[PDB]
């Protein structure tokens, strides 16, 4: 049967799937301890993204603007960047890292960000001779790529900046791990996996503490845990495990080229097989055995999914949208549980890469139903297909697609980013064995509630 790749047939967008590159660069930066990204452009480019992160996480994250105004848009914005760096340093005495993120406006007018960084480094060295602030140029014009590409670009620039400063030294015995754009609950699960395997690793970025407590001492703990030192130590790792081709593998490639740290790109670990293959690669690189505890967690997940697959999932048609690593990985997970992912939507201009993704051939060789993969897609592409008569049983995607599912009376599982219209999702893993279990149970529970509300054999939920 056939997996066909097709582009959106319209020039414009209705209902964008992703945000722009600068938004993704901000997301990368907020995972770094003692980091406040500085977004060089107009004020909206900062404030709307701070809101987006508050929608997903229900937390505040600090990001600053250079406040480009009309004078700077006409005569150049270098002084706004320079002033913003100094104002951050003067008011935030613990600040260590400032990714300086460009926008459409400051790409169009040609501001020389590397020049402004030289100016700022001299000014900071003179004003604060006992501090070191790392200024990383992040070139993220919004008229290319998407937040996915901006995330990858920011990670790569920040690693290049920090590792250029420190270089290679003592071998650390640790893995570098780039999970991509995942939730705090994903990072929790990976930390547990590595602990149970006795494998030391740094996870870039460590966003576990984004789910921060309300504490009796009123302290604010909502910070990235990845430090300058952690980043610098990437040059000394045993190996890099890159879980996401479009969300950090290019940093693993840079560390391989610069420092001879071997990069191992694996399929993103959605579902059982992809998790098995990630653990096999960890055991190969480290020489550590996979522990019994993971065989058990695997087995618990399979037991749970088996209570659902042939009863409730078989032959049910699914559309999936989100980040490309998530879409392709979830399509593989869906087929393990007898779902039929017939429509996959990926939301940016990177189709020349997607066509060469090995997971497309892996789908070609396991699917018994046609699959349409729309690249450069917007969410109108989904809604239009449903209007034209595509029969879906389930949608998997982020919350900005909610009205499509609501109006079409299709159950929808919230995955990826942002998931603002349900509570607690950022805490639940989607990757790994526990994550496959949790995803499968969310799917069933969404279907079950839909059978009740629609009175569709609701009586059947007794002795399954």
Residue numbering of the annotated binding site for [8Fe-7S] cluster: 20, 45, 104, 142
Q: Is residue 268 part of the contact set for ligand CLF (CB under 6 A)?
A: no
Q: Is residue 148 part of the contact set for ligand CLF (CB under 6 A)?
A: no
Question: What is the C-alpha separation between 452 and 15, in angstroms, rounded?
Answer: 30
Cβ 70 to ligand CLF, closest distance in Å?
12
Q: Give Cα 228 distance to the centre of its chain.
A: 21
The torsion angles phi and psi of 215, rounded to 5 degrees, stand at -105, 160
Cβ 238 to Mg ion, closest distance in Å?
35
The binder of 384, among Mg ion, another protein, ligand CLF, none, by C-beta within 5 to 8 A per type, is another protein
Cβ 296 to another protein, closest distance in Å?
11
Among 24, 29, 31, 42, interactor with ligand CLF by CB under 6 A:
42
**Cβ atoms 416, 423 nearer than 8 A:** no
**In terms of Cα–Cα distance, which of 332, 353, 351 is closest to 341?**
332
Strands (E), 146-219: 175-178, 201-203
Question: What is the C-alpha separation between 401 and 347, in angstroms, rounded?
Answer: 12
The torsion angles phi and psi of 418, rounded to 5 degrees, stand at -95, 145
Cβ 289 to a second copy, closest distance in Å?
15
DSSP conformation class of 311? I
What residues between 384 and 413 interact with a second copy by CB under 8 A?
399, 402, 406
Token pair in block for residue 378: 């917007």
Q: Is residue 143 part of the contact set for a second copy (CB under 8 A)?
A: no
Q: Is residue 434 part of the contact set for ligand CLF (CB under 6 A)?
A: no
What residues between 41 and 60 interact with a second copy by CB under 8 A?
51, 54-55, 58
Cβ 387 to another protein, closest distance in Å?
10
What residues between 288 and 307 interact with a second copy by CB under 8 A?
295-300, 302-304, 306-307
Question: Phi/psi zone of residue 39: left (φ > 0), alpha (ψ -120 to 50 degrees), beta?
Answer: beta
Q: Is residue 64 part of the contact set for ligand CLF (CB under 6 A)?
A: no
Run of H or E including 272: helix 272-286
Token pair in block for residue 315: 């032959």
Residue 303 or 370 with smaller CB distance to Mg ion: 303
Run of H or E including 148: helix 147-166
Residue 142 or 176 with smaller CB distance to another protein: 142
Among 83, 303, 361, 452, interactor with Mg ion by CB under 5 A:
303
Q: Is residue 20 part of the contact set for ligand CLF (CB under 6 A)?
A: yes
Residue 86 or 123 with smaller CB distance to another protein: 86
Question: What is the C-alpha separation between 447 and 444, in angstroms, rounded?
Answer: 5
Cβ 179 to ligand CLF, closest distance in Å?
25
User: Which SS3 state, helix, strand or coil, does residue 97 take?
Assistant: strand
**Cβ atoms 243, 177 nearer than 8 A:** yes
Question: What is the C-alpha separation between 267 and 263, in angstroms, rounded?
Answer: 13
What residues between 50 and 79 interact with another protein by CB under 8 A?
50-55, 58-60, 62-70, 72-73
> Binding site, residues?
20, 45, 104, 142
Sign of the Cα torsion 411, 375, 325, 61 reads negative
Instruction: Catalog residues that contact a second copy under the rule CB under 8 A.
Output: 51, 54-55, 58, 211-216, 295-300, 302-304, 306-308, 399, 402, 406, 420-424, 427, 437-438, 440-441, 444-445, 448-449, 452-453, 458, 461-464
Instruction: Catalog residues that contact ligand CLF under the rule CB under 6 A.
Output: 20, 22, 41-45, 48, 103-105, 142
């Amino acid at each position: 049967a056939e997996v066909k790749l097709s582009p959106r047939d319209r020039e414009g967008i209705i209902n964008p799937m992703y945000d722009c590159q600068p938004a993704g660069a901000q997301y990368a930066g907020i995972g770094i301890k003692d980091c406040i990204p500085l977004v060089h452009g107009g004020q909206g480019c900062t404030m709307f993204v701070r809101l987006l992160f508050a929608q997903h996480f229900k937390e505040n994250f600090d990001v600053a603007s250079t406040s480009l105004h009309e004078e700077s848009a006409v005569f150049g914005g270098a002084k706004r960047v320079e002033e913003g760096v100094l104002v951050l340093a003067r008011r935030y005495p613990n600040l260590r890292v400032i990714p300086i993120i460009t926008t459409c406006s400051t790409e169009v007018i040609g501001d020389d960000i590397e020049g402004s960084i030289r100016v700022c480094n001299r000014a900071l060295e003179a004003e604060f001779p006992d501090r070191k602030i790392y200024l990383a140029p992040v070139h993220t014009p919004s008229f290319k790529g998407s937040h996915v590409t901006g995330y990858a670009e920011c990670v790569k620039s920040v690693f290049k900046t920090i590792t250029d400063a420190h270089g290679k030294g003592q071998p650390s015995g640790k893995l570098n791990v780039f999970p991509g754009w995942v939730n705090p609950g994903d990072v929790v699960l990976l930390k547990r996996y590595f602990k149970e395997m006795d494998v030391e690793a740094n996870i870039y970025m460590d966003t576990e503490d984004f789910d921060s407590p309300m504490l009796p001492n009123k302290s604010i703990e909502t910070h990235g845990r990845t430090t300058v030192e952690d980043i610098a130590d990437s040059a000394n790792a045993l190996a890099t495990l890159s879980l996401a081709r479009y969300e950090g593998n290019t940093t693993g490639e840079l560390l391989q080229k610069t420092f001879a740290v071997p990069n191992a790109l694996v399929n993103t670990p959605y579902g059982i097989k992809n998790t098995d293959d990630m653990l096999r690669k960890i055991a190969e690189v480290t020489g550590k055995e996979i522990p019994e505890s993971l065989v058990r967690e695997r087995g618990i997940a399979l037991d749970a999914l088996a209570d659902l697959a042939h009863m409730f999932f078989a032959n049910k048609k699914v559309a999936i949208f989100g980040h490309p690593d998530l879409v392709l990985g979830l399509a593989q997970f869906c087929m393990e549980v007898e779902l039929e992912p017939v429509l996959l939507l990926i939301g940016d201009d990177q189709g020349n890469k997607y066509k060469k993704d090995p997971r497309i051939e892996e789908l070609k060789n396991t699917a018994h139903f046609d699959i349409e993969i729309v690249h450069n897609a917007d969410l109108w592409e989904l809604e239009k297909r449903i209007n034209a008569g595509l029969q879906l049983d389930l949608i998997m995607g982020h919350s900005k697609g909610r009205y499509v599912a609501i109006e079409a009376n299709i159950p929808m599982v919230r995955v990826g980013f942002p998931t603002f219209d349900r509570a607690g999702l950022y805490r639940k893993p989607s990757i790994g064995y526990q994550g496959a279990m949790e995803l499968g149970e969310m799917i069933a529970n969404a279907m079950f509630a839909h059978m009740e509300y629609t009175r569709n054999k609701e009586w059947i939920l007794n002795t399954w």
